[PDB]
Amino acid sequence: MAFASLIERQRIRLLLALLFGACGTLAFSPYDVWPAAIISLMGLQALTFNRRPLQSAAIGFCWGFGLFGSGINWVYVSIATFGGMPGPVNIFLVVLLAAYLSLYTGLFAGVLSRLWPKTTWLRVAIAAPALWQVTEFLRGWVLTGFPWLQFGYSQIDGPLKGLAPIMGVEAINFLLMMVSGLLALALVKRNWRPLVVAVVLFALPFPLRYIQWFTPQPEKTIQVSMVQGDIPQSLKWDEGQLLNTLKIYYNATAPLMGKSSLIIWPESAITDLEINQQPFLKALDGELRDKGSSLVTGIVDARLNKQNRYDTYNTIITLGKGAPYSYESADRYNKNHLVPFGEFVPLESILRPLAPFFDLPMSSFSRGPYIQPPLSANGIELTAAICYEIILGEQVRDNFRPDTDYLLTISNDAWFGKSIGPWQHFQMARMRALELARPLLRSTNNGITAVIGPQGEIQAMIPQFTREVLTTNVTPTTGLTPYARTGNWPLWVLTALFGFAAVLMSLRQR
Numbered sequence: 001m002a003f004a005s006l007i008e009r010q011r012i013r014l015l016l017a018l019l020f021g022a023c024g025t026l027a028f029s030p031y032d033v034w035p036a037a038i039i040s041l042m043g044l045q046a047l048t049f050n051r052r053p054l055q056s057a058a059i060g061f062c063w064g065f066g067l068f069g070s071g072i073n074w075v076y077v078s079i080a081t082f083g084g085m086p087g088p089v090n091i092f093l094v095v096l097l098a099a100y101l102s103l104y105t106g107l108f109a110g111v112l113s114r115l116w117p118k119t120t121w122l123r124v125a126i127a128a129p130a131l132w133q134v135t136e137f138l139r140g141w142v143l144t145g146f147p148w149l150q151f152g153y154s155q156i157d158g159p160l161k162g163l164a165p166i167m168g169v170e171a172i173n174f175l176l177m178m179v180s181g182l183l184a185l186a187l188v189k190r191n192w193r194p195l196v197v198a199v200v201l202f203a204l205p206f207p208l209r210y211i212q213w214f215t216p217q218p219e220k221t222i223q224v225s226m227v228q229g230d231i232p233q234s235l236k237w238d239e240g241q242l243l244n245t246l247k248i249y250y251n252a253t254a255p256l257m258g259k260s261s262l263i264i265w266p267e268s269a270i271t272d273l274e275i276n277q278q279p280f281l282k283a284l285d286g287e288l289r290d291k292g293s294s295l296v297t298g299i300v301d302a303r304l305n306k307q308n309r310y311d312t313y314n315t316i317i318t319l320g321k322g323a324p325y326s327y328e329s330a331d332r333y334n335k336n337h338l339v340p341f342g343e344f345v346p347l348e349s350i351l352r353p354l355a356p357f358f359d360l361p362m363s364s365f366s367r368g369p370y371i372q373p374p375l376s377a378n379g380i381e382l383t384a385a386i387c388y389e390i391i392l393g394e395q396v397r398d399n400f401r402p403d404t405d406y407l408l409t410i411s412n413d414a415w416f417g418k419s420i421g422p423w424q425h426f427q428m429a430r431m432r433a434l435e436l437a438r439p440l441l442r443s444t445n446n447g448i449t450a451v452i453g454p455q456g457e458i459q460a461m462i463p464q465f466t467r468e469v470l471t472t473n474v475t476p477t478t479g480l481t482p483y484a485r486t487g488n489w490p491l492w493v494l495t496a497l498f499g500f501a502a503v504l505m506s507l508r509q510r
């Protein structure tokens with residue numbers, strides 16, 4: 001009796017939704033069980049059937065809470081190591097983040113149930129992917145966004161990967177939601193017709209994975225090195241640890257000079273202000289040039305502006321052959337999209353006049369422009385993105401140029417230790433190489449350092465948590481994928497057409 005009440009049946013769906021959401025985490029690296037994405041989304045689509053909209057919203061929230069609570073709780077590692085807060089507060093902040101992101105999946109399920117209450121193929125295959133595109137856009141946009149755990153990234157090594165160079169990863173997000181809805185409808189209606197459509201829609205993109213939208217340029221093959229310094233995270237200012245860090249990177253780099261055309265040091269590899277390291281940079285620049293090598297490295301640049309204040313940038317500088325170092329060189333990249341709660345706090349500008357001055361951080365990061373030219377070194381054009389920025393597919397594509405030779409991302413993922421976070425990050429980085437058909441050079445502090453090929457494949461990699469140099473031959477590519485040509489406006493046009501048709505039909509019951 002009691003287990004069969006209406007409130008109990010709804011609470012069972014909430015529990016199932018939590019589990020199906022958590023199943024979705026298995027789709028991403030390091031687990032890479034890409035069928036888990038479909039299982040997860042089937043649960044979301046099926047458990048929201050035949051619900052009042054507020055019930056469906058609660059189910060979508062709990063599904064999100066399962067997904068995000070199991071999938072991004074690795075942020076705890078950084079909070080607990082550097083936040084100085086008590087254990088229960090650290091857990092609460094993680095629960096808070098997961099609940100915040102689950103508002104968007106609750107939003108999805110509530111609106112889907114409100115406008116498409118009946119269990120139909122139009123709900124699951126037309127309305128749902130268009131609506132999901134919108135709510136996932138809002139999750140990636142509101143308060144500068146956090147578009148982490150999009151299931152399309154789980155197809156980097158999967159049957160649907162050929163879709164990404166055509167319309168971008170969000171087209172895989174779209175198709176996965178559509179295919180999983182049809183499977184949910186087939187299960188619940190016990191009907192073979194939606195299953196056949198789902199398998200057909202899922203299988204049609206398979207041969208696209210064999211398209212090379214690029215041509216290799218073996219006449220430009222070079223040896224590249226990426227120095228994984230494995231520098232432990234600092235807490236106070238210490239010139240002694242700064243000098244040991246420069247020592248590690250220089251000594252690893254010296255024997256590569258004249259052999260690697262390109263050497264890369266990761267995000268903030270030089271943990272001092274650029275203005276404070278002019279002798280070292282000039283001396284290093286001459287050594288590199290005298291041997292025909294170039295260096296690209298992260299650094300912090302507090303740059304005095306015409307208002308006689310300092311704009312502090314998270315920066316990539318260039319040195320050596322084809323990139324003569326100068327503090328006034330334009331051959332540099334300034335991070336545009338700061339990491340929320342890492343490099344700034346959302347809404348902190350609205351609140352600054354209330355804060356005691358002694359409680360404000362010593363300084364804050366400014367932002368580079370949304371589009372910056374490629375870096376140039378040793379005749380090589382590198383489209384750069386620092387750390388988190390590599391997950392912003394449209395922004396990387398908007399910075400990409402036809403004459404880009406390689407994608408470049410440098411990152412310091414040490415904040416998150418041995419967790420799945422660095423693996424999820426790395427998996428998303430690979431999607432950019434596939435989307436734009438360029439090899440990606442990913443240089444990190446302690447992992448994951450790798451060369452990704454122009455179809456997202458791992459061409460070379462070194463283990464995490466080692467002080468080591470990755471040295472390999474890399475070949476640039478040329479050619480434009482359709483997605484490089486367009487960006488995601490074609491997917492948005494399809495989203496509008498599905499959304500228009502679905503909302504029109506939903507209104508037709510008037």
Ligand SMILES: CCCCCCCC/C=C\CCCCCCCC(=O)OC[C@H](O)CO
Binds near residue numbers: 091095
């Ligand atoms: C029904 C779904 C949950 C309902 C919503 C409540 C949120 C859960 C809050 C606390 C659970 C305990 C969290 C797991 C145990 C703590 C984990 C921990 O202590 O982590 C320390 C360790 O160092 C890590 O590496």
Ligand SMILES: CCCCCCCC/C=C\CCCCCCCC(=O)OC[C@H](O)CO
Binds near residue numbers: 058097099100
């Ligand atoms: C097992 C623990 C008991 C749980 C009981 C079953 C679940 C309750 C039903 C729906 C979730 C509650 C409402 C969730 C949305 C309300 C607002 C919220 O909690 O999220 C705020 C967000 O954190 C802002 O940043």
Ligand SMILES: CCCCCCCC/C=C\CCCCCCCC(=O)OC[C@H](O)CO
Binds near residue numbers: 071
């Ligand atoms: C264990 C519950 C038994 C219920 C049976 C059905 C379970 C639902 C299916 C998969 C859940 C597994 C979730 C994926 C595991 C995530 C691992 C994790 O959270 O790692 C923490 C941090 O994010 C990384 O360091």
Ligand SMILES: CCCCCCCC/C=C\CCCCCCCC(=O)OC[C@H](O)CO
Binds near residue numbers: 166167481483486490
């Ligand atoms: C009336 C028919 C039903 C309504 C529509 C059915 C859905 C169509 C699905 C995908 C669009 C396929 C074409 C768009 C994909 C390619 C777009 C693209 O990016 O290619 C352009 C670029 O210029 C290349 O170089």
Ligand SMILES: *[Se@H](CCCCCC)CCCCCCCC(=O)OC[C@@H](O)CO
Binds near residue numbers: 014018061062099
């Ligand atoms: Se969804 C799982 C339900 C499964 C079994 C039901 C019987 C449970 C989701 C947990 C909600 C976490 C609430 C987060 C929170 O406390 O936010 C704080 C916020 O209000 C402060 O602004």
Ligand SMILES: CCCCCC[Se]CCCCCCCC(=O)OC[C@@H](O)CO
Binds near residue numbers: 039183
């Ligand atoms: C409701 C059906 C859901 C999806 C249907 C797909 Se058919 C299942 C077998 C599909 C077999 C594909 C290989 C799976 C995989 O991802 O391997 C993991 C490995 O890479 C590292 O864990």
Ligand SMILES: CCCCCC[Se]CCCCCCCC(=O)OC[C@@H](O)CO
Binds near residue numbers: 020023046049188
């Ligand atoms: C990996 C996590 C798995 C957790 C185990 C769950 Se087993 C239940 C399978 C069944 C899948 C969901 C239940 C279907 C349902 O009840 O929805 C129909 C309803 O909407 C119509 O009104």
Ligand SMILES: CCCCCC[Se]CCCCCCCC(=O)OC[C@@H](O)CO
Binds near residue numbers: 087088092095
């Ligand atoms: C219903 C939703 C409410 C959301 C808020 C609940 Se967060 C649960 C905290 C759970 C507390 C776990 C204990 C952590 C710990 O490490 O305690 C030792 C510490 O004092 C030493 O630093």
Ligand SMILES: CCCCCC[Se]CCCCCCCC(=O)OC[C@@H](O)CO
Binds near residue numbers: 137
């Ligand atoms: C009150 C405000 C809410 C409005 C409700 C409808 Se939002 C319509 C989406 C508008 C679509 C703009 C998309 C531009 C873009 O390219 O962003 C990348 C995107 O694909 C994903 O990251």
Ligand SMILES: CCCCCC[Se]CCCCCCCC(=O)OC[C@@H](O)CO
Binds near residue numbers: 039187190191
């Ligand atoms: C781990 C996997 C989780 C869920 C994946 C299964 Se998708 C369920 C499809 C459901 C299959 C459709 C059944 C059609 C039917 O039974 O009716 C036709 C009958 O009349 C012919 O004799």
Ligand SMILES: CCCCCC[Se]CCCCCCCC(=O)OC[C@@H](O)CO
Binds near residue numbers: 125126172182193
């Ligand atoms: C990357 C985005 C690609 C978008 C392609 C849209 Se193709 C239109 C599919 C049509 C939508 C679902 C049709 C399934 C169906 O008809 O099954 C229910 C019926 O059998 C019950 O009698």
Ligand SMILES: CCCCCC[Se]CCCCCCCC(=O)OC[C@@H](O)CO
Binds near residue numbers: 157158159200203206
């Ligand atoms: C009905 C469509 C007609 C034409 C379709 C083009 Se060929 C169909 C094969 C479609 C292949 C999709 C499933 C592949 C898979 O199961 O994953 C492989 C696993 O090893 C990855 O880890």
Ligand SMILES: CCCCCC[Se]CCCCCCCC(=O)OC[C@@H](O)CO
Binds near residue numbers: 413
């Ligand atoms: C007030 C509502 C919340 C604001 C909305 C945005 Se949610 C905050 C993002 C979650 C916190 C960021 C997670 C760290 C990370 O993504 O690092 C990747 C990279 O840095 C590797 O080193």
Ligand SMILES: CCCCCC[Se]CCCCCCCC(=O)OC[C@@H](O)CO
Binds near residue numbers: 070073094419
């Ligand atoms: C289901 C909703 C629950 C939401 C709150 C979950 Se808090 C669990 C924290 C778990 C934090 C991730 C663990 C990763 C790890 O073990 O690495 C540590 C090591 O690297 C350090 O250097």
Ligand SMILES: CCCCCC[Se]CCCCCCCC(=O)OC[C@@H](O)CO
Binds near residue numbers: 166482
């Ligand atoms: C249900 C159907 C969904 C299909 C969506 C993925 Se296939 C889309 C077209 C895939 C092919 C895109 C064409 C790229 C191109 O630029 O070729 C034209 C050029 O040759 C002319 O001068």
Ligand SMILES: CCCCCC[Se]CCCCCCCC(=O)OC[C@@H](O)CO
Binds near residue numbers: 485486490497
């Ligand atoms: C009714 C069908 C619904 C499905 C949507 C298909 Se959109 C057709 C694309 C048609 C292809 C046109 C390509 C235009 C181009 O490459 O201009 C460069 C510009 O995007 C740079 O911003």
